[PDB]
Design a binder for this molecule. Structure first.
Ligand SMILES: Nc1ncnc2c1ncn2[C@@H]1O[C@H](COP(=O)(O)OP(=O)(O)O)[C@@H](O)[C@H]1O
Ligand SMILES: Nc1ncnc2c1ncn2[C@@H]1O[C@H](COP(=O)(O)OP(=O)(O)O)[C@@H](O)[C@H]1O
Ligand SMILES: Nc1ncnc2c1ncn2[C@@H]1O[C@H](COP(=O)(O)OP(=O)(O)O)[C@@H](O)[C@H]1O
Ligand SMILES: Nc1ncnc2c1ncn2[C@@H]1O[C@H](COP(=O)(O)OP(=O)(O)O)[C@@H](O)[C@H]1O
Ligand SMILES: C[C@@H](C[P@@](=O)(OP(=O)(O)O)[C@@H](C)N)C(=O)O
Ligand SMILES: C[C@@H](C[P@@](=O)(OP(=O)(O)O)[C@@H](C)N)C(=O)O
Ligand SMILES: C[C@@H](C[P@@](=O)(OP(=O)(O)O)[C@@H](C)N)C(=O)O
Ligand SMILES: C[C@@H](C[P@@](=O)(OP(=O)(O)O)[C@@H](C)N)C(=O)O
Ligand SMILES: [Mg+2]
Ligand SMILES: [Mg+2]
Ligand SMILES: [Mg+2]
Ligand SMILES: [Mg+2]
Ligand SMILES: [Mg+2]
Ligand SMILES: [Mg+2]
Ligand SMILES: [Mg+2]
Ligand SMILES: [Mg+2]
Lengths: 340, 341, 340, 341
């Protein structure tokens, strides 16, 4: 008897497509002798459908109305396959949504109502990692260095001449680099601010952090954390934004990612231990990808924490995992077992 | 039409009983000329049902298997009638659940997915106001004083002699004083940790904060805030735990509450302004009740923020609004309108 | 029946005198209705004596040979009051030694053999906090920023022209500022190195950390940490070295200490939480004073951790404690109760 | 005179029995022309006694209530004879205790206080080599590869499925394989955590490291190091746990050890050089046995460092020295002389 895994993807969110790709690789690797996956696509306009498999043409006549119910006795989906909505049991739920709806505690809220065990972070930790400002606040309180930043509310009007350049401008709650800009001088502050506001009514302005990006993929609950190899992004210019590029699977035009990171084993361990505390400080479980800056002084600053990280074929986390000897199938399985 | 309002109540939560009470009031005051209320009760064990009305024994052979769906096109409910689930449209959602599932962003999570407009706080402010230690961290970052506290997680075994008594022990994520206790001596610490551990695997030890409790009912969305009259609780011993008492509608045994509070007009306005700053700093909307301590030194310390406050007939929030001239029919309407904004 | 508290002081150590003063204030505050203190002075040459009370003239005809025994069934002292060594029971041991012999795990080793419960840090955490290098190594591994430093072994010969000034030079294992120097330029590197070597055959050279000194007094075991108010040392020049000054009780000539620190409540909380992790990373218990640097950027660097901190009347820790509402007597009592 | 040497053995430690064995050998090889040995046994329960000699049943109505005192003028022992404690001078101390109290800097702490010269490592290197996780942290900082591991403290409850098997479970601070176990499947994890938890409130989960165990006996103080022949252990299953086996003097059931190891002269020298770097990086002196893993890739990984290695008749350390031409009478003498340096 296969464990019935609802795998949610798509979503009403600008990262919709990254999500569809995350889902296409999960589908292609989960072990189907042990798991019976139910694919729940969420369209961009927020419509829920059960389909056959995730793909770029996932929306099709064969799909049908299927939601996750909040009701604990149903513990499952309400599906319309014939002329009638029927209840189908789910053993466990693995959402692959990214960003809005998916990592911001929203889907976690339904999982919680349903009583259906699920993969990864709970509500409050998804809400804390999603709002970058909220994440710096909890991170500072635990004693984790972070960028200096200013929250720009909807009605605010920062005066540009007051900052020191460069700066980064960005939505408080997006991902995949939607709305992010390196800002080099004052007359571009506004344009950047308005762009970040296409994605959230509240945006942040960060001091630039120097150095390079070092990431750490983490797996587990509180008592025992498994980390993959540390990765490193070096940028020839601009910012990291692989999913915004044309043909991302072909390699980035401005960024080079090395794994393991080209750093001693002492430096890499250090980055991992830092990632573990960030993770514990935020109250994460299951998985998250902890992204950091490694300054030339060698000190580690938090960048952000991505709780439901990309699983695309050119994604950071599965890659960090495979390099530590955990391939995707085994990854998927341990995540599901940790949910159970 | 009238605006269809789904009113959720009960819950898989220890504040279940306070919630049914909260819902009873709301059902008795909402204006049915303007609104068509749809009552969904959730059992203590997570089962959703549409009933005619909130009451002490609301589950009846009348009550509907009925869930609010996360689907945007459905924009409403899946209701079982004739053994088949069908779609019923809803205009706005007003959750009267309290605590677990209700103030911790769980319900808000489903409301967000559904696209139905809903009353009250979003998910992150609900999560931050629900975990008391999260609220202190965020209020502190914004300049609000808070009690000193210690997070005690599930497997911790703190030595009692470490603390300076008295101390308050409590769950991180509960309400209505479930699991709360003033502990005056180390030898009582263990008892209180275990009792709190019934409502959360995580629990707080707090510095006793001196003074009296002054609360403030807040209404509005970002900026335009209305406040009620400040209320004020004096205790003869123990802690405020009115919902836990014998027949609370008849009054408290150890607590007296005054509204407006017996403080100068300038002190009251100052508390209302502190209340306001806490509200914005936490990113609340719709409503909340901001509870504080006024110390002798005149310093205002955050106690906690109750994002979906009780609406029972002896509750603090409706009573503060009412003292400011907004009685329940109206508050309800302001809340729904705010959800519709 | 009073709890019999052996209070050890003095020691074969350059901080001997600070220790005697620490002891004179403990004696003047411990509650004698609850505790029956046994004063064990250790001379500078390492001779053990039981005396009447700690004082600058503690060594006197009335004292007599008294050691702590390693034997668990004795669980006490072997005292020679008459013509014979007799065994006297001890319920608990509070050592007030500082530095060598006392905070370096040495006295903790005897406590451990004896089975007599004792105040504060165990062996490995005293050994780790004592050797500043050892402390930076464990601290880096946990992800705690520290100064950049070089271990100068006995046989090494650093070449001065290679450093960037200023630097601090210091014994790997002393305290009270014995052997410490701010070094401003290269031709003073040696003189400083030789001076630090009067106190340890291994010395360290640290990059200067900018900003000011913020300290945090911590009390407790792992599960629950009580911290006093944060303190701040600002220096008009030179280094902090109050116990090296003439007439220290009269106030320092170069340093001003504020408590609570003149910083927001957010900044102070942050320093406290950082101190808690440093403490947990090092595996401390009972008490320690965690000293940090607060950089103008606002980031917190470790300076050192002092496990058996000064209790003199002008000492940092009791002061941080009293300011948080815990006066010395209550302090002493909770430390002893935590040992028990 | 002969040099008076206090020889401590037994201990309040689970390696108590291995220690008495270690002491038996030493008493049988020390040169009594040069040295006058003074045997202090410590019971399993912490009681100190002077006896005629180390043996399986060394406690006798002959054995002395006798402690090594921390006092510098006494420079030796307080010995009970005629019901009165008296001072006996000692020249040098050689502890043959193993593990708890013996390799964790406890005994070294008393030796430091006493000013008696003593054999072996100081307090901090003993503490760092005793807590395996401490050793990995310090070796790693110095560039030595180490196993990946997880610290599991007393109240932790790790989910087993998290790990990749096989995994090694063990106490942080023990020896002789007490509490160690190769766990090949998650369902065996719990058993192994609990069994390790008998010897330490803190325990380690380690990545299985592949290859064979290659060890190295080190002799000397800072710099001038002598090393024995590299030894090498091949296992047919399970783990090396010779002291735990039936009648180990007769050999192991699952383990074969070869010395010199069956590796090129260049690989052996390289391991000895790695051994040397580990020794200095940890600040050891006197002696230690540095145990490593040689992987197929030829990489050397630290297993652990045994600061006071066993001296039984089937022990690794004496045997490595002996293969290099230094037999026990001599090693003992080199150790004492080093303590006298
Ligand atoms: N403050 C910063 N300092 C340096 N680079 C930054 C900063 N903020 C953003 N970036 C760059 O922009 C990229 C993405 O922004 P990020 O904060 O990670 O948002 P998202 O969740 O959309 O990835 C980072 O990977 C990094 O290259
Ligand atoms: N730290 C504190 N100092 C003083 N009184 C406290 C403190 N914490 C709780 N109390 C008392 O206990 C009551 C209930 O605790 P509270 O923190 O408001 O949690 P909840 O009301 O959500 O259950 C308060 O109303 C007050 O009377
Ligand atoms: N690296 C450093 N950067 C700035 N000041 C330093 C540094 N190291 C030492 N100091 C100064 O010297 C004082 C004492 O040195 P410290 O490392 O604290 O040794 P001790 O244990 O003797 O106090 C500090 O209080 C500080 O003023
Ligand atoms: N991580 C590891 N990888 C491979 N084998 C191990 C590992 N840890 C322990 N072992 C095996 O278990 C034995 C005992 O564990 P060890 O770490 O040497 O502790 P101790 O010997 O102090 O009791 C080793 O000799 C080796 O056979
Ligand atoms: C590049 C990255 C995107 P994502 O995980 O994280 P942020 O864009 O950094 C989704 N949200 C990945 O797929 O690994
Ligand atoms: C006393 C109170 C309860 P609640 O609003 O707040 P907490 O008990 O503080 C529910 N949760 C009221 O009904 O006003
Ligand atoms: C100044 C300080 C000394 P000590 O505690 O610490 P270090 O000198 O910083 C002893 N060792 C004190 O007495 O508070
Ligand atoms: C096998 C071994 C034990 P010991 O030296 O080392 P660990 O068991 O590795 C005691 N502690 C020996 O006697 O050589
Ligand atoms: Mg992101
Ligand atoms: Mg990013
Ligand atoms: Mg509450
Ligand atoms: Mg309350
Ligand atoms: Mg010091
Ligand atoms: Mg200092
Ligand atoms: Mg060992
Ligand atoms: Mg071993």
């Amino acid at each position: 008897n296969r464990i019935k895994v609802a795998i949610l993807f798509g979503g009403c969110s600008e990262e919709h497509d990254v999500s569809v790709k995350s889902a296409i690789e999960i589908a292609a690797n989960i072990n189907k002798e042990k798991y019976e996956p139910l694919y729940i696509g969420i369209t961009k306009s927020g419509v829920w459908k059960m389909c056959e498999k995730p793909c770029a043409e996932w929306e099709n006549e064969n799909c049908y109305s299927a939601v996750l119910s909040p009701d604990k006795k149903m513990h499952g989906l309400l599906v319309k396959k014939n002329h009638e909505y029927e209840i189908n049991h789910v053993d466990v739920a693995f959402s692959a949504l990214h960003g809005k709806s998916g990592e911001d505690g929203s889907i976690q809220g339904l999982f919680e109502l349903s009583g259906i065990p699920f993969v990864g972070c709970d509500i409050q930790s998804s809400a804390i990692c999603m709002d970058k400002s909220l994440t710096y606040i909890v991170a500072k309180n635990a004693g984790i260095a972070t960028p200096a930043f200013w929250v720009i509310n909807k009605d605010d009007r920062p005066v540009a001449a007051t900052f020191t350049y460069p700066v980064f401008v960005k939505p408080a709650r997006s991902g995949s680099s939607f709305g992010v800009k390196k800002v080099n001088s004052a007359d571009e502050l506004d344009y950047a601010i308005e762009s970040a506001r296409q994605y959230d009514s509240k945006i942040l302005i960060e001091q630039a952090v120097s150095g390079c990006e070092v990431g750490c993929a983490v797996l587990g609950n509180s008592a025992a954390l498994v980390v993959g190899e540390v990765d490193q992004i070096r940028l020839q210019y601009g910012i990291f934004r692989i999913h915004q590029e044309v043909e991302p699977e072909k390699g980035s035009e401005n960024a080079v990612i090395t794994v393991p990171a080209d750093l001693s084993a002492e430096e890499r361990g250090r980055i991992q231990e830092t990632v573990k505390k960030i993770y514990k400080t935020l109250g994460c479980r299951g998985l998250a990808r902890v992204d950091m800056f490694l300054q030339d002084r060698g000190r580690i600053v938090l960048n952000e924490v991505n709780t439901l990280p990309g699983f695309t074929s050119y994604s950071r986390y599965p890659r960090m995992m495979a390099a530590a000897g955990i391939s995707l199938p085994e990854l998927i399985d341990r995540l599901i077992v940790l949910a159970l």
